[PDB]
Amino acid sequence: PIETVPVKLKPGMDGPKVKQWPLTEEKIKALVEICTEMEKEGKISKIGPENPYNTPVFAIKKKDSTKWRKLVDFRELNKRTQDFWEVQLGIPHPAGLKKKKSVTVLDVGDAYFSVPLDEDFRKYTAFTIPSINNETPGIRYQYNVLPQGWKGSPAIFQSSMTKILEPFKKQNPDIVIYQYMDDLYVGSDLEIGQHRTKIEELRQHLLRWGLWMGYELHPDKWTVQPIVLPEKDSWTVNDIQKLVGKLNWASQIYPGIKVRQLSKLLRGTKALTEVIPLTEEAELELAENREILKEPVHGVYYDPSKDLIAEIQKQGQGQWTYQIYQEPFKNLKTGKYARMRGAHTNDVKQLTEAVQKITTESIVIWGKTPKFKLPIQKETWETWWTEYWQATWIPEWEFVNTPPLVKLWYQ
Amino acid sequence: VPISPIETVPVKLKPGMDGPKVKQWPLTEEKIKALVEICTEMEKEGKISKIGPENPYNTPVFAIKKKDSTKWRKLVDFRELNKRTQDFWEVQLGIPHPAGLKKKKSVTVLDVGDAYFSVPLDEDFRKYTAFTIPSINNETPGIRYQYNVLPQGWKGSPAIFQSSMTKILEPFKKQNPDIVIYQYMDDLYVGSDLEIGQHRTKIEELRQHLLRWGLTTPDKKHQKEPPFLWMGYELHPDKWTVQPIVLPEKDSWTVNDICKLVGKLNWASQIYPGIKVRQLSKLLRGTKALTEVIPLTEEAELELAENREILKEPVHGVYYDPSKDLIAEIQKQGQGQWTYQIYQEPFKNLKTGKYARMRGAHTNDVKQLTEAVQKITTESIVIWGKTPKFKLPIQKETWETWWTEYWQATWIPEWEFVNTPPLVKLWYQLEKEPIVGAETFYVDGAANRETKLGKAGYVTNKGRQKVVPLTNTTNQKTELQAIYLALQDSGLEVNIVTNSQYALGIIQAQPDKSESELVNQIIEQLIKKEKVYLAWVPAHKGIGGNEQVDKLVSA
DNA sequence: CAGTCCCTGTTCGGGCGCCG
C-alpha cells in the first residue's frame, strides 16, 4: 500500500538489451528456487516475449557464506538512468568514513523488497533464466519491488532509511553511516570489540523494521605503494639503462626528474654486464630523485564530476600493483596487493579479488566505482570472472594489452 | 470468430510507423491453386477472415513445397511489416544437444500439427496483416484476407509460440515434476524413469492436457518405439548419432557449393572427429562472386578426400552420465587448427569439435591452446552446465613457465598432461638478466614517411657495426629489421638493446607464428640461439650506443 | 603542438549448415 516514486529513463535512450550468458548447473538451480520463492512473495512475476528489454542474471556466495545470493547485471540499466540517482535524490558522501579505524559492510538488500516499484519502469527490469542444454526456452520474470543492485533503489529508499537510522544516529552521533547500493558502510573509531557490538545493535535495530551480514575493513591501515628506486652498491650498464628508462617514465608524473648526469655515464658503447662507477654528479642526481618520489604529486586532487579510472599490473609471484586516477599521470592512489586468494595457481581469481578490493576502497574514499583497465584478454575474462565474484556490485571495465615497459611500480 | 483457449500476447507497431501497403507479387498458376486451396480451408476453421476496403494495408504472399509431402506451406513476405513492428526478445537461447540427455527408462516423441495455426494473434494487430491473393485473372480484384493466428513469416510468431507453449506445459510440469520435457518449438521429447505401464498413461494425460488448449498430438507423428528421430538425430536406448549427411559431388565447383560443403562439414564435426576445413575455407578468401566457378587446389582436394573417408565409417555418440566425471581432450591437428573430443568413458565420445580461429597477427601454440579451451568450456556449460576436466598436449612445466611470466592474466581449469605429439611447447625463452660474455648490440631503425626509405643497423661493445639501406619500408619495419640483423651477425648468446616499444612487445609475447614475413625470420633466428636478452631504452636521451646508432640510421 | 599513418584488435554485415 506504498506509493511508487515515478522514474524515467534519461532522455533519448532505450532500455538495456543485453543477452543472458550461459550459467552453470548450481547457479540455475539456485535461481529457480529463489525466483519461485520471490514469485510466491509477490516480489517478481512472469512476463512474455513482448518485452524487448533484458538483463543478465547470475548467483554468488559472499565470503564465508553458504547461502546463494541472486545478482543482476544492471550496469547497462544504471548507465541509462543516471540522471535520477545523482540530480534528484543524491546521497552525500561522508569524507570521514575513510579515516575510521574500522568499517563494516552489511547486506541490507533485503529491505528493498518492502517498497513497490514504479509500474511504468517495470518494463526495463526484465531478466531471463537459462536452462541446461536449453531444455526449455527462457523462463522470464520482472521485478515488482525495488530490485537488488539497481542505482535507483537506495535513492528511493533513502527517505525511509534516514528515519530508520535517526533513532540510532541520535544515540550514536560519532558513528558514520554510508549507504552504497545493497551495502551499508558503518565506520567508528571504537575498539574492535565494542565496534562489533554496535553492529549487532544495528542488526536488531534493522530487524524490527523488516530486514544480515558482516565484513570488516580497516581503512586507517590502507597504505600506498610509492615508486621506489633500487639501492645497490655496484651498478652495471644494464642497471643504469633500466634506471634511466624508469626515471624517464616517472618524469611524466614528477616534472622535477632529470637523467642528464646518468646519461653521461652511458657515453661509450659499453657491454651491458660491464660495471660502471658512479660519478660524483650522478650519485647526487640519484639521491635527489629518490626524495622527489617521496613527495606527493603537485596539483593532484579529486574531481566529483570526472570519472574514476583504475589500472592493474600483474607483477608475478602473487604481486599486483594498481593506480587510481581521473587524469593521466595524476594518480589519486597507488598500491600493491599480495598473497591474495589463488596466489601462484590462478590469475583470474586474483584479478577478480583485486577488482573487488580496489572497488571497495573506491566506495570508502570517494563513493564512486572506477572503470577498470584490466590486463586480460576479453574472452579469458568473460568466461571465468563470475566464478569468483563475491560482491553485490559490479564495476565497469575494458581490456588492454600493454607489454611491460620498464617496471615503474614494482621493483 | 470464437475465442481461443490460449492467452494472447499484446503487440504494437513501433511508434510513428503505419502498417505495410506494398504490392503483391505475380504468382504461378500452380501456386495460386495451392494457395486458394489453403486460403479457403483456413477460412473455414477461423484462421483467416476477409476484409473490405476499410483495411488500407497490403503485403505480399507466396508458397513453397513442404518436405516429403504433397501439402504446400503458406508464407507471408512481411519484410515491410517486420521493419515497423516492435522489437521482441527471443527466448530460445540455444539448440539442445543429445549429449546432454540422461538415460531415461521410457522415451516418447511427438510433433503437433500446424503449430503456428493453433495459437492466436493479438486482436488490435490483425489489421496490419492485410494481403491480397491474385486470382488466375489479372483483372479479378482478388480476395483480401487478414490473419487471425501467427503468420508463418512474421518475426514475432516463433517467439510468441515458444512462450505460450511453456505456459501450457507448466501446469503439467508442476503436477509431473519428474517428467523431463525437452521443449523446442512444437517437438516434445518426453522421458521418464517410471515403468513403461505408467509411461503411456502420462503420455495420454499430456495428449489430453495439450488437447484442452487446442494442441493436437497426431498418432501419425507419435513415436513410441526406438530409434526416435529428434532434432536430426537417431536416439537409441544406449547410443545416438546424426542423421545421414549428404555432400555435393560437383565436377565444376562454384563458391556456393563450397559454402554448402563447408557448412555441412562443420555440422558433421560434432560427432565425426578429425574434420578439417582449413584449405577448403582458403578458397573463399577474397572471392568476388557467389556463383563464380573456382578450381579446387591440390591441398583442397586432399582435404575433401579425407573427410569423405571419415564420413564412410559409422560413428555414434553417448549420453551424459552425471555420476562419472566429464573429460575433454585436445590435439594439434594443423598450423592454426585444433580438434577436441568430450567423453566420460574412453573412446565413448559424447561429442567432438574443432577450433581454428586465428586471433591477431602474432601468436603461439600456447595462446591458441588457451583460446580453444575457452571455446570448449563455454560449449560444455551450455550443454551440461559444468566445466570438463582437460587432457592437454602441453607439459605441466611448459604451461607453468608461460602463465607465470606472461603479463596478461591467463589460466586453465583443472587439467592433466597427456603425451600425445605434437606437444605444445615454447620454442625459445628470453633471458631475464643480461648475459655475461655476450656481445651487446645497440640497434635502432628509422625511415622517412614520404620516401619510404630507411636504414637499420647496430653498434657493439667489440667495435662491430653495420647499416643497411631499405626500400618500401616504415619506421616499425626498420626497427624490427635492425633486430633481425643483430641476430644474424651475433654468436649463440647475444644482448640486444633497442629503443622501439613496438618491437620489444611483439617478441616478449614469445610468438612462434606470424602474418608478417619479417617476424617469421626473426622467430627463426631466435630458436637457433641458446641465450637471448632484450632491453629497452628511451631514444634521443644520449644512451650508450643507442645515440650513436640513432645518428647512423638517421637518414 | 595537433596532424598524420603504421599497426593491431574489434565489431558487424552476409553467405551456408542445422532445427522448428
Next chain:
DNA sequence: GGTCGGCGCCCGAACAGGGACTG
C-alpha cells in the same frame, strides 16, 4: 522458393585506439 526466429562457422569491410614522428 526467395518468410520468420534461434545457434554455429568463415570472410572482408568498417570501426577505433594507441605510438612514433612532424608543421
